[PDB]
């Protein structure tokens, strides 16, 4: 993390083994690239406009398109690792509860978004609006997929 910004608590890889991506509870959205011969990494901070947020979960698409964030504000941030820029913000109105603590991007263009209350929501990309809602007890901390994704197991 930079010296102006804060500290990072998340990591993820991609569909090529040179990208490594971190978010933060202080906004350090940085898409690194791996440089084995010189044994160093090269970061690139992602511009998101003036949307400084606090985010605690990362998931990426199966075809390495876009990485997805779940912020404390209750906002799904989708950004590009190939142009280092934002693509789409979350729910305009009716935002989520205590911040999205678990995101799991499916093989489709969809995403199983959780909450700090247990509002597991399957939503699509452009509106981030709920399609099927079921309330879980406890704040959602883990959304796994049984491979193909027909039986996803949620931990709280």
């Amino acid at each position: 993390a930079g010296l102006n910004v804060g500290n990072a608590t998340t990591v993820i890889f991609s569909k090529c083994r040179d990208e490594m991506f971190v978010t933060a509870g202080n906004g350090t959205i940085r898409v690194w690239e791996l440089d084995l011969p010189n044994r160093k990494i090269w970061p690139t901070e992602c511009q998101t406009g003036q949307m400084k947020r606090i985010v605690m979960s990362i998931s990426m698409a199966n075809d390495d398109s876009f990485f997805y964030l779940g912020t404390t504000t209750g906002d799904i941030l989708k950004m590009n690792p190939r142009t280092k820029l934002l693509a789409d913000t979350g729910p305009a109105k009716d935002k989520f509860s205590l911040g999205v603590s678990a995101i799991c991007c499916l093989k489709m263009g969809g995403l199983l978004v959780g909450s700090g209350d247990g509002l597991l929501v399957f939503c699509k990309s452009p509106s981030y609006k709920p399609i099927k809602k079921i309330q879980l007890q406890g704040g959602i901390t883990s959304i796994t997929l049984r491979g193909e994704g027909h039986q996803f197991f949620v931990g709280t």
Binding site: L3, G6, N7, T9, G25, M56, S101
Partner: protein, 107 residues
């Protein structure tokens, strides 16, 4: 004009330039004038041309030939690693009057 019998007929380990068997107007940005084309040794590859020889011709390239043949693995144990400047001073969080928050597993 020396036609330079191949390889082992020079003090420099080289066959020599083949040479030229129009002069484009070029306003380039690295050298003072146009008639001193090798003023600051731009285009001179004297280090790379000295790395193909066994023994270099200048008596100043001997500093740093066998550097890629290390004789000793370095014992990096008795160092002077700074700990008072790096374990006392935090960067920025003000954590002391912050809540434990998300993921505060304690020993």
């Amino acid at each position: 004009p020396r036609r330079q019998d191949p390889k082992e007929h020079s003090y420099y380990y080289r066959q020599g330039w083949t040479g030229i068997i129009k002069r484009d107007p070029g306003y380039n940005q690295k050298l003072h004038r146009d008639d001193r084309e090798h003023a600051k040794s731009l285009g001179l590859r004297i280090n790379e041309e000295e790395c193909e020889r066994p023994v270099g011709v200048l008596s100043s390239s001997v500093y740093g030939r066998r550097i890629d043949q290390p004789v000793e693995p370095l014992n990096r144990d008795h160092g002077r690693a700074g700990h008072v400047k790096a374990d006392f001073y935090r960067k920025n969080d003000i954590t002391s009057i912050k809540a434990p928050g998300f993921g505060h597993i304690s020993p």
